[PDB]
Amino acid sequence: DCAKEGEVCSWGKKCCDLDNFYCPMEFIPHCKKYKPYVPVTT
């Protein structure tokens, strides 16, 4: 079992593909697809 795209991650579950998806930092994070290659300060 895993959290698909748009599914609650972190406290909820672990995103099926953490490599292609990331878990946001909020009250109820949702699996979101991303592909960064040039991270910047923030």
Q: Copy the structure tokens of residue 16.
A: 């099926």
Number of structural domains found in the chain: 1
Domain that holds residue 4: 1-42
Classify residue 2 by its DSSP letter.
Answer: -
Closest CA to 30 of 8, 13, 3, 4: 8
CB 20 within 8 A of CB 9: no
Q: How was this structure determined?
A: NMR
Closest CA to 8 of 20, 34, 24, 19: 24
Q: Tokens 């923030």 map to which residue?
A: 42
